[PDB]
Ligand binder design. Structure first.
Ligand SMILES: Nc1nc2c(ncn2[C@@H]2O[C@H](COP(=O)(O)OP(=O)(O)OP(=O)(O)O)[C@@H](O)[C@H]2O)c(=O)[nH]1
Ligand SMILES: [Mg+2]
Lengths: 87, 1107, 431
């Protein structure tokens, strides 16, 4: 599982005062699980959480994760990317 | 109307100087420009007002000497796109044509590389521009290698280019060699250059054919745009060189087309343009054969040449040409020869060359061309010779005069309207309509020429179905287009190869007989009575359909004057209707592929005969018809599945019409001899092992009238209910059970309602037993090898419960009980919330029809006010129930009611945990929207959890509802719905849920069921207390399963849960658990995985399991 | 010697066919002039399946290109390989169908349909024994949408004993903003069900998402999608152009992969995913390829193969992998006890192994399965077809040419029945 894990950094563009986090999540994880994780961490409703993933290979770009039944591997979420959460 | 993208166009070109280096931006602009330009490909004349500035923004870029080659190529691409959109002929009149624009263009073209395929758009357009600069009225010597020599070399080098540039070299040399100073300098040189290329090159290589095509195009353009007296001396050498090449024998279409185009031009040069060397005698010899070519492009090009040559030659040769062209219509030719001859005749008549002497001949051929359809295999050919006949007829309006056409107008006008209605191709109909309009506008001597155009205009000969039942009657209304129009349909369409043409023709004759009953009963019916003896299979079906339709029409006509049907049809014709069955039974035509067609035709014939009250009652013909119907309803599996429903719905209708017409003794009664045998045989046929036998006999028994059910209704109902019951032998018998319910519903709708008569109609004595059979088939959920076939058995089980509930509502609504009505409502609600889309739509439609029914209102409607407010009348036709998005948001609201909670939730669980993706995605969103409103109220959440646990307990050890429910529970727990129950230790709800899950995951083998169980066991760790520890133990039991995939999935789920909920494990031991779940291969041998499992158990406080 | 006639119609169809022909020519070792210069005898034992042996040892293609608009015709005529296609195999008009299905199938595309039959019949007369026709077009438009259906309906009447295979390219709102696309797609699918034995669906939304995420391209143009389409086409037609133990012809493949008549839409794919320009970066193995062939990301359609049953499965491997190494890998993934076992890789799968690898890659793989998830491609168009049908928007254009609501409701009922049958078969017992 060590090779399958990916270290993602959670950003907060709407709340720049917050610090940039860093969590090692499994590659075979659905965006439905990450939504609940963020809801339980930041105490924000699940439905009121728009996710997105920005690769360091594509600066100036943002992909929206609207589908919840898909995993992070399908969205080309490689190691070292950043996840921008909004609400 | 006008160009509206110009506001965006001037900005695009403004960015041409910036997106010239980048590739992505250039491609986006080019694609964008192309999608902006292709919208006006039908309206090319709308861009002319913008052809001024739009060009100035392009040619001005290449003119600048301080620009790169990429920008020049990008601008030439847009220039070529604009030329393609509008047209080079109308676009090159805008290109610079000064004497100071020639040397610029020449050097520009000479700076190009023919090998660069990417810049092909620059070489194809540049050449064209040069042609413009060749239009100046100045001499090339005044400009001064010379310019003429350079232009000639460029043309010679481009005329053999395999790219599109070759075409650009055709219009160029056509204007450079045809000049005064250059037709006495370069013409002879380019002439010895073309002859050598034509004599050396062959049509066996790709480069030899390219050069030949280029040379032929150049010569054809030169002889076209060149002086007649200048290109006359060199008219024999080129012709001889072309004849010595043997182009007709070559296997190239473009080469032959160019050869014909050059031969016709050479022939036009010999004759003087007025309002004949021996060489001409050969030219014609090379054109006539062109009409008998294999390709249509060759004939279309030869027709123009022949038409242009007949007008520059005398009247003796002009008549000889027509006489020779008429020979193509002999009895030893194909359809291509006829097409070529028609094209040549049209081209000749368009110019006014045909004399009235050839009227008796030409008119004697066109009549054969408008109805050409010579079967050439499975399908027939002739649509080409028919489109040409339309153009030929269109030319008579300009050639002959009214005085010369009057003798043949009576036949031309009729043929035009006959071919402009019943034609199979819309193009032929439109061409015939245009020809008729042109003839009426010019000649104006056609019977009712104006009245026929107003009803059959260009926007009226579109729908083929409308032309057979609207325009046909309007044309037959007059006495000039009735008998021939009927004879055409009788001797052409009703004997056609396609079956749609033998059905449409019959339906058209049905209406045509109303305006001409005498002619259809004394002249047409005898011809359809003899056509049935035709060995042709398509001929017998058409004749039977016509005999049925005309008979029905005559019966309907006689019904007006309350007159008998024998008034129009004589007894001789009547004897044919009786012997038609004997003729088919003797020859044994009910076999092979045509047997089904013959049976279907005879069924419709018998139905139309019984619906007309014929004098056939008490004859052997009725017995023969009954035997045939029984044999058809006896042998159904032998018929193909692509036409079984038609035979099933037609035979039952014919039997009902016969059993509701001939099989009667007195009003309100029937012949007991037939009643004691038909019902007995049917009840002995409803127990047939073959499923198709019952599928056909149930509907036949149910379609019987009401007077034929008096006294024998209980037996029929019992026999139909015996089939609806499932047994060990009848497991996959869904089609039979469907027909069993359909026949019961039909019987209920026919008999109606009548108190004090259980054997005659439905009443309160047997309504309960009938409702019990309808409510029992809804629970059928068979899963055969084909799939979920039980759905079918449910479809007919829904409509049967609708039409019935309304029947009582229109007579004795008090019979409908409250419990039965509530059960039906709950079952319909459950059936209107299924993952399926086609079935859910019908379920919702039935529910809305049953709820909105208020005439009178139906009793026992649970929560009638809430249901009406949640499903208003406006949300019936506007809402699409087939789409989950436009259905689940409105169906999830039903959970608020108490009655609509258990069944609705059970039905929605299948959609919230099925296989389809979009349905689940929509159902989850619709359920979360409703849960958000009952999330704070603890009573609502408790009731929902109780109902879910009850549904779980009901469907235990069931792989139809257990897996969907377990999958939906995972999402329900991940979303955070049961958040109030987490603030209490030892929650009975979470205890019973875990207990039921342990039951459902007991020895679970399949991996699909194990995944949902593992997910639920990991999403249940949120509940503190004894449910947290015990649940954890289960995870351990899954970390050392019998498969490595299960262990890996369990480890991944445990790792995810450890990151989700942080209060489950202390921070002091979380590091060890995280490090043990990372560097551990859970897909290895169990000998090493057991140690890791024990280590994790010792850390998580879980007691050590025991084998 | 079984020959196949390839036909191309519409702008997108011609652009896909040109790229596919260029790819299969560069893989076979054929210079753009016409001669042969490869370095392998296996590139000639089956060249007659798609190339006629003309005089001088030249190989003439068999691509019949037709297009009402004179746009893509000139581009393909002056392309890198434009000099290969016979010059009288190009059939075109001037004005197209104006994004109307009732124009390129009744009033306009039926004006060149006769010249198309003459050309396709003149091309087949030289063949010794024809196997089946082929067509490459896009459901979006009128000359691709109506012309393809008209030709399929006209050829089946004269050659009922020939296989009919197509490569429909379902459009998507992301690639095109045209609003008259749902009707053209519905009317095309209505005819592609009753007169077609096999249809390879290549959704445009899938390729768009792949180029947006996987390739990380800035503005995915038509070239990026055409490259992937041609790669998938070349990977699918590997057994019909190279030797091998699995000598599955066209008819045999259609009979073994299409048990039902109406159900015949596949979900073609290909791996590894690459783009234009560079390509050599990482060398994949057989395990990695097998793990990636069956991923929904490597599929060229917006469908999840895992979510839905598996009618028929098939895979084609290209490179120095052996059918013995492949069988070992295909017999351990259909077993649960086996490690790294997958639940979406089904059993009784068809498998192939090729020698000649693709261009720019040493090892690759192609997937040609038929899963019920393809129903999602039919429902997405159904909704867009209903919301616009209730208001009768843009219906006058169709009613004026000759069409009527009868054909519309017939196509709607056919699509609904197909979706219902797919959903019913999705829930079937495995054993
Ligand atoms: N993948 C891909 N899709 C294309 C391409 N060209 C067009 N399309 C799509 O196909 C549809 C347009 O159909 P076209 O092929 O351009 O049209 P046509 O068949 O020539 O028909 P007309 O518009 O009537 O002339 C839209 O959905 C486009 O996005 C292409 O090269 N590749
Ligand atoms: Mg086009």
């Amino acid at each position: 599982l060590k090779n399958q894990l990916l270290t993602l950094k959670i950003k907060y563009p709407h709340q720049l005062d917050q610090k940039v986090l860093e969590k090692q999540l499994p590659g075979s994880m659905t965006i439905q699980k990450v939504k609940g994780l963020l809801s339980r961490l930041l105490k924000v409703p699940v439905s009121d959480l728009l996710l997105s993933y920005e690769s360091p290979k594509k600066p100036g770009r943002e992909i929206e994760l609207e589908n919840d039944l898909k995993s992070l591997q399908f969205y080309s979420v490689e190691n070292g990317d950043c996840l921008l959460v909004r609400w | 109307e006008a160009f509206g993208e110009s506001a965006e166009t001037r900005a695009l070109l403004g960015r041409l100087r910036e997106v010239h280096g980048g590739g992505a931006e250039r491609e986006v602009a080019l694609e964008r420009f192309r999608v902006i330009m292709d919208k006006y490909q039908e309206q090319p004349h709308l861009l002319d007002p913008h052809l001024e500035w739009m060009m100035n923004l392009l040619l001005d870029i290449v003119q600048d000497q301080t620009s790169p080659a990429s920008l020049v190529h990008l601008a030439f691409k847009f220039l070529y796109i604009i030329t393609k959109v509008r047209g080079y002929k109308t676009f090159l009149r805008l290109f610079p044509h000064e004497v100071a624009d020639v040397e610029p263009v020449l050097d520009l073209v000479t700076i190009q590389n023919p090998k660069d395929h990417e810049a092909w758009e620059t070489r194809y357009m540049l050449l064209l521009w040069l042609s413009v600069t060749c239009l100046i009225p100045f001499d090339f010597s005044r400009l001064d290698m010379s310019i003429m020599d350079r232009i000639l070399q460029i043309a010679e080098s481009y005329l053999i280019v395999s790219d599109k540039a070759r075409d650009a070299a055709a219009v160029l040399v056509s204007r450079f060699i045809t000049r005064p100073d250059v037709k006495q300098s370069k013409m002879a040189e380019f002439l010895d250059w073309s002859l050598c290329n034509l004599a050396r090159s062959s049509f066996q290589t790709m480069q030899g054919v390219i050069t030949m095509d280029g040379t032929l195009q150049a010569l054809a353009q030169i002889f076209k745009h060149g002086k007649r007296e200048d290109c006359l001396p060199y008219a024999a050498t080129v012709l001889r060189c072309l004849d010595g090449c043997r182009l007709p024998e070559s296997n190239q279409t473009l080469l032959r087309k160019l050869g014909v185009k050059l031969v016709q031009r050479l022939g036009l040069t010999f004759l003087k343009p007025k309002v004949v060397p021996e060489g001409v005698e050969r030219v014609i010899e090379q054109l006539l054969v062109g009409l008998k070519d294999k390709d249509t492009v060759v004939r279309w090009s030869a027709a123009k040449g022949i038409g242009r040559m007949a007008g520059r030659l005398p009247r003796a040769l002009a008549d000889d040409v027509v006489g020779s062209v008429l020979d193509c219509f002999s009895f030893q030719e194909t359809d291509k020869a006829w097409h070529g001859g028609c094209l040549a005749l049209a081209e000749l008549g368009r110019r006014g060359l045909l004399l009235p002497s050839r009227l008796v001949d030409v008119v004697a051929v066109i009549l054969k061309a408008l109805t050409y359809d010579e079967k050439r295999g499975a399908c027939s050919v002739g649509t080409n010779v028919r489109d040409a006949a339309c153009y030929v007829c269109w030319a008579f309006a300009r050639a002959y005069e009214p005085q010369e056409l009057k003798p043949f107008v009576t036949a031309i006008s009729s043929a035009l309207v006959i071919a402009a209605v019943f034609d199979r191709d819309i193009n032929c109909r439109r061409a015939a309509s245009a020809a008729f309009q042109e003839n009426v506008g010019r000649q104006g001597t056609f019977p009712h020429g104006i009245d026929i155009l107003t009803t059959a205009d260009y926007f009226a000969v579109g729908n083929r179905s409308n032309c057979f039942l609207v325009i046909s009657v309007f044309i037959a209304g007059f006495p000039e287009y009735t008998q021939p129009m009927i004879d055409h349909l009788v001797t052409m369409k009703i004997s056609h190869w396609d079956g749609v043409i033998r059905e449409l023709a019959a339906r058209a004759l049905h209406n045509l007989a109303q305006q001409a009953p005498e002619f259809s009963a004394t002249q047409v019916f005898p011809r359809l009575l003899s056509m049935t003896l035709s060995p042709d299979l398509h001929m017998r079906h058409g004749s039977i359909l016509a005999c049925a339709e005309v008979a029905y029409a005559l019966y309907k006509l006689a019904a007006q004057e309350n007159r008998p049907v024998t008034d129009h049809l004589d007894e001789q014709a009547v004897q044919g209707l009786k012997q038609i069955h004997q003729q088919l039974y003797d020859r044994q035509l009910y076999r092979g592929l045509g047997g089904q067609l013959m049976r279907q035709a005879v069924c419709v014939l018998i139905e139309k005969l019984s619906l007309s009250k014929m004098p056939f009652r008490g004859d052997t013909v009725i017995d023969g018809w009954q035997w045939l119907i029984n044999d058809t309803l006896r042998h159904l599996h032998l018929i193909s599945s692509h036409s079984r429903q038609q035979m099933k719905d037609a035979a039952v209708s014919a039997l009902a019409a016969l059993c509701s017409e001939y099989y009667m003794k007195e009003p309100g009664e029937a012949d007991p001899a037939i009643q004691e045998e038909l019902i007995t045989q049917y009840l002995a046929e409803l127990r047939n092992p073959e499923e198709m036998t019952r599928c056909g006999f149930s509907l036949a028994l149910g379609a019987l009238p009401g007077f034929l059910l008096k006294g024998r209704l209980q037996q029929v109902l019992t026999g139909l209910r015996a089939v609806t019951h499932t047994s060990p032998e009848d497991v996959s018998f869904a089609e039979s059970r469907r027909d069993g319910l359909k026949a019961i519903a039909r019987i209920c709708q026919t008999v109606g309602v009548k108190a004090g008569a259980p054997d005659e109609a439905v009443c309160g004595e047997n309504v309960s037993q009938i409702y019990c059979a309808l409510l029992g088939c809804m629970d059928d959920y068979t899963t055969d090898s084909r799939g979920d076939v039980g759905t079918w058995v449910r479809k007919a089980a829904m409509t049967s419960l609708m039409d019935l509930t309304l029947l009582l509502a229109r007579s004795q609504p008090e019979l409908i009980e409250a419990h039965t009505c509530e059960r039906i409502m709950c079952c319909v609600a459950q059936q209107a919330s299924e993952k399926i889309d086609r079935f859910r739509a019908h379920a919702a439609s039935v529910f809305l029809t049953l709820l909105h029914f208020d005439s009178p209102p139906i009793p026992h409607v649970p929560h009638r006010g809430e249901l009406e407010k949640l499903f208003p009348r406006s949300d019936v036709a506007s809402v699409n129930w087939s789409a989950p998005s436009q259905a689940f948001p409105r169906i999830t609201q039903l959970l608020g009611l108490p009655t609509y909670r258990y069944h609705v939730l059970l039905g929605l669980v299948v959609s919230l945990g099925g296989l389809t993706e979009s349905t689940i995605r929509h159902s989850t969103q619709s359920l979360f929207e409703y849960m958000k409103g009952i999330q704070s109220d603890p009573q609502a959440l408790g009731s929902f959890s109780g109902t879910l646990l009850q549904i779980f307990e009901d469907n235990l050890l069931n792989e139809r509802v257990s897996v969907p429910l377990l999958k939906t529970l995972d999402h329900v727990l991940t979303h955070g719905c049961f958040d109030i129950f987490t603030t209490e230790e030892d929650h009975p709800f979470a205890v019973k849920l875990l207990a039921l899950c342990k039951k459902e995951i007991k020895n679970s083998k399949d991996i699909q069921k194990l995944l949902s169980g593992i997910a639920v066991f990991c999403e249940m760790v949120q509940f503190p207390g004894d449910v947290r520890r015990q649940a954890l133990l289960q995870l351990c039991l899954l970390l050392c399963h019998r498969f490595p995939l299960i262990r890996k999935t369990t480890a991944s789920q445990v790792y995810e849960t450890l990151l989700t909920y942080s209060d489950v494990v202390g921070a002091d031991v979380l590091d060890e658990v995280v490090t043990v779940l990372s560097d551990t291969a859970w897909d290895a041998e169990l000998a090493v995985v057991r140690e890791q499992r024990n280590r994790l158990c010792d850390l998580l406080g879980v007691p050590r399991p025991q084998l | 010697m079984r020959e196949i006639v390839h036909i191309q119609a519409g702008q997108c169809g011609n652009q896909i066919g040109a790229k596919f022909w260029e790819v299969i020519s560069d893989e076979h070792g054929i210079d753009p002039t016409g001669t042969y210069h490869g370095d392998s005898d296996l590139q000639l034992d089956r060249i007659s399946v798609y190339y006629n042996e003309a005089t001088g040892g030249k190989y003439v293609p068999r691509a019949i290109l037709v297009d009402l608009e004179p746009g893509t015709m000139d581009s393909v005529r002056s392309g890198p390989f434009g000099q290969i296609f016979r010059p009288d195999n190009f059939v075109f008009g001037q004005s197209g169908a104006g994004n109307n299905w009732a124009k390129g199938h009744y009033t306009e595309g039926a004006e060149l349909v006769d010249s198309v039959l003459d050309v396709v019949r003149k091309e087949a007369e030289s063949c010794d024994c024809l196997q089946g026709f082929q067509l490459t077009h896009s459901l979006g438009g009128g000359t691709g949408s109506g012309m393809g259906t008209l030709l399929i309906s006209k050829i089946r009447e004269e050659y009922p004993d020939r296989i009919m295979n197509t490569f429909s390219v379902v459009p998507s709102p992301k690639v095109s903003d045209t609003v008259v696309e749902p009707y053209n797609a519905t009317l095309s699918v209505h005819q592609l069900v009753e007169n077609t034995d096999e249809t390879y669906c290549i959704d445009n939304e899938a390729l768009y998402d792949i180029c947006f995420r996987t390739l990380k391209l800035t503005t995915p143009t038509y070239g990026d999608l055409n490259h992937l389409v041609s790669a998938t086409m070349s990977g699918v037609t590997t057994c019909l152009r190279f030797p091998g133990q699995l000598n599955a012809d066209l008819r045999k493949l259609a009979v073994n992969m299409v048990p039902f008549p109406r159900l015949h839409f596949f979900m073609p794919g290909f791996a590894p995913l690459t783009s234009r320009g560079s390509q050599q970066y990482r060398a994949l193995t057989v395990p990695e390829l097998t793990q990636q062939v069956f991923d929904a990301k490597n599929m060229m359609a917006a469908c999840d193969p895992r979510h839905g049953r598996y009618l028929t499965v098939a895979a084609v491997f290209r490179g120095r992998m052996s059918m013995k190494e492949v069988d070992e890998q295909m017999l351990n993934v259909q077993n649960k006890n086996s490690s790294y076992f997958v639940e979406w890789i089904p059993n009784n799968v068809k498998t192939a192994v090729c020698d000649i690898p693709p261009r720019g890659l040493k090892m690759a793989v192609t997937f040609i399965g038929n899963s019920t998830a393809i129903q999602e491609l039919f429902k997405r168009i159904s909704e867009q077809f209903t919301a616009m049908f209730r208001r009768k928007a843009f219906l006058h254009w169709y009613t004026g040419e000759g069409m009527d609501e009868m054909e519309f409701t017939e196509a709607e009922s056919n699509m609904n029945d197909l979706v219902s049958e797919y959903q019913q078969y999705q829930d079937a017992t495995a054993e």
